């Protein structure tokens, strides 16, 4: 299964699944900087699922590893903003992170396999 390009539609599909999850609600759009004026000083690099989808659709990811690094930043930014590990949003972030990691594993595996096959000879 050595299609070097197949990751992109696989990631579009997975982002669609994540937008259908009620658990993505708090991560679907950039955090409001006027609503959270201190957000700026806790979080250096904001990240949300609309930004990831638009970066993919612009052709500005070279690999699913780069998409995966931005999705992981959403979840790390939530673990950093959370004042409690028994909070609504941080709790939503941990379930969504598990769903994402369960689905991205095969995408990364298939891509890395396809690149090794391309450089086999
Ligand atoms: O307001 C946000 N995002 C816009 C939005 C949220 C809900 C509905 C529509 C739009 N947030 C998401 C990021 N964040 C946290 O991860 C977090 C951890 C502990 C408390 O919040 C702060 C809230």
Report domain extents, the chain: 1-121
Token pair, residue 17, equals 């699944």
Q: What angle do CA 64, 15, 70 make, to 5 degrees?
A: 50
Contact 31, 104 (CB under 8 A): no
Q: Which helix (H) or strand (E) holds 113?
A: helix 88-118
* Minimum-distance ligand 1 atom for the alpha carbon of 79: 18
How far CA 31 is from CA of 16, 19, 20, 81, 119, in Å, comes to: 20, 16, 19, 11, 42
Q: Rounded to whole angstroms, how far apart are CA atoms 77 and 118?
A: 36
Token pair, residue 91, equals 């709790």
Q: Which long-range contacts (CB under 8 A, 24 or more apart) does 100-107 make?
A: 100/14, 100/18, 100/71, 100/75, 103/14, 103/17, 104/14, 104/64, 104/68, 104/71, 106/10, 107/7, 107/10, 107/11, 107/14, 107/64
The 8-class DSSP code of residue 25 comes to G
In the structure, how many helices (H) and strands (E) does the chain have? 5, 0
Ligand 1 atom 7 nearest Cα:
26
Coil/strand/helix, residue 44? coil
Could you tell me the distance, in angstroms and rounded to a whole number, from the CA of residue 75 to the centre of ligand 1? 11
Contact 33, 17 (CB under 8 A): no
Using what technique was this structure determined? X-ray
* Ligand 1 neighbours by CB, cut-off 6 Å: 25-26, 29, 31, 78, 81-82, 87, 89-90, 93
Q: Rounded to whole angstroms, how far apart are CA atoms 51 and 47?
A: 7
Token pair, residue 27, equals 């991560």
């Amino acid at each position: 299964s050595y299609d070097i390009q197949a990751w992109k539609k696989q990631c579009e599909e997975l982002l669609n699944l994540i937008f259908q999850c009620e658990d993505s609600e708090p991560f679907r759009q950039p955090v409001d900087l006027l609503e959270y004026p201190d957000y700026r000083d806790i979080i250096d690099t904001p990240m949300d699922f609309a930004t990831v989808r638009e970066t993919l659709e612009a052709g500005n990811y070279e690999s699913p590893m780069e998409l995966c690094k931005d999705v992981r930043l959403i979840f790390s930014n939530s673990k950093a903003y959370t004042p409690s590990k028994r909070s609504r949003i941080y709790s939503m972030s941990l379930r969504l992170s598990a769903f994402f990691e369960e689905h991205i594993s095969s995408v990364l595996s298939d891509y890395k396999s396809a690149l090794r096959f391309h450089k086999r000879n």
